[model samples]
Target: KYTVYLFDFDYTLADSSRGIVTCFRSVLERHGYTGITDDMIKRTIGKTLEESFSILTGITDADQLESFRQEYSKEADIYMNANTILFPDTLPTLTHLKKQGIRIGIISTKYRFRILSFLRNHMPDDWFDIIIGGEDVTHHKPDPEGLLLAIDRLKACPEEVLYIGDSTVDAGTAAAAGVSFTGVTSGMTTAQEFQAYPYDRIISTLGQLI
Candidate 1:
């Protein structure tokens, strides 16, 4: 059993991937681009909009990414507030995990403020032991810094912790940080892709976790 559990935001706890896809479409249309598919947007999950846009569009300039973010955030905010839905099982599972006395943290590539705001609206901020966002560290997932930062903040050992996420990047980050990893198929990444990396367990939902 683990003493601590690290969670990924976006798709793991909530079904915000559609919000991301819509926001990406809004940005693409604003820039006169068209035909961007859901698969393309889905591939961008787990990465910052800056990283995702640069990789997906090959527009690498910081200014362009910022512009995309500005446009995207405006729409994202509207979607998040009005349309987003948390996964049906996430709240119950979190409650159960907490009852087991396992500390929980969120290590996400989403911007810290956005992550915090979502939590404020959908979940209790004080429920988490720590939450580290993309801006909180120079490196994001597929790297260990964010996960390790969560561990450090929790004053925990990797051996006693597990990382749960819905992306390959999350599995890679967990492996890099020397923590056990579990992948949930509720998000963008497929079980096959997630299996390309090392994960201690691969489950279909948060309910399967406990």
Candidate 2:
């Protein structure tokens, strides 16, 4: 077992796909963009809002991108918060890991406050020891900045940590951070897709970790 257990919030720990898609669609429609599908937004779940917005809107101007992000953030704050639900196995798995004396943390592209709000509502006050969000880093998943930050803050080495996530981005983050990765198929990634990546192990559910 690893001494530190870091996780991706959106798909790995919480089943927030519905809320994410809703928020993405809302932002696109409000901005006068049409012909966009839920699947399109869903595919961009683990990416930053700016990246997603650029991909959807094809808006190449920096100022325009920032403006679009601001609007998207406002709608996301409400819709994502209201629609997100923790997976049934998430709490139990986390609780078990904590009992085993493992250090737990969350590293994701989502906002820190938003993730904290969800945790405060559904989990024990001290369940997570650290939370590294998009606002905390200059780069996101597939970059390893967030994961590296968590490792630095935790004062732990990569070998002692295992990053759990549900996408190729997470796997790439772990790879870049030199940490172990355990992929779960609860979110956007398929079992076969995960199997194709370089994961330490892959499971169908979070409960398997416990």
Model 1 residue 207 distance off true place after TM-score fit, in angstroms: 0.5
Ten residues in sequence with the least summed lDDT for candidate 1: 76-85
Badly placed stretches (over 4 Å) of model 2 are none
The TM-score leader among the candidates is 2
Tens-digit per-residue lDDT, 1-210, candidate 1? 799988998889877777788888888888887777888888888887788888778898889889988888888778754555789898999999999888988898887787777778888657898889888999778889989888888889879999999988888888899989999999878888886899887899889998
TM-score, model 1 to reference: 0.93
Q: Name the candidate that leads on lDDT.
A: 2
* RMSD, every candidate, angstroms: 1.5, 1.2
* Candidate 1 global CA lDDT score: 0.85
Per-prediction TM-score, please? 0.93, 0.95
In model 1, the Cα lDDT at residue 37 comes to 89
lDDT of the candidates, in the order given: 0.85, 0.88
Task: Give, for candidate 2, the lowest lDDT window spanning 10 residues.
Answer: 188-197
Query: On residues 1-210, what C-alpha lDDT tens digit does candidate 2 reach at each position?
Result: 599999999988898888888877887888799999887888788988888888988987889889877887887778887898988899889989888999999999999988988888888896888999989999888899989999999899888999999998898889898999999988778878876568988998999987
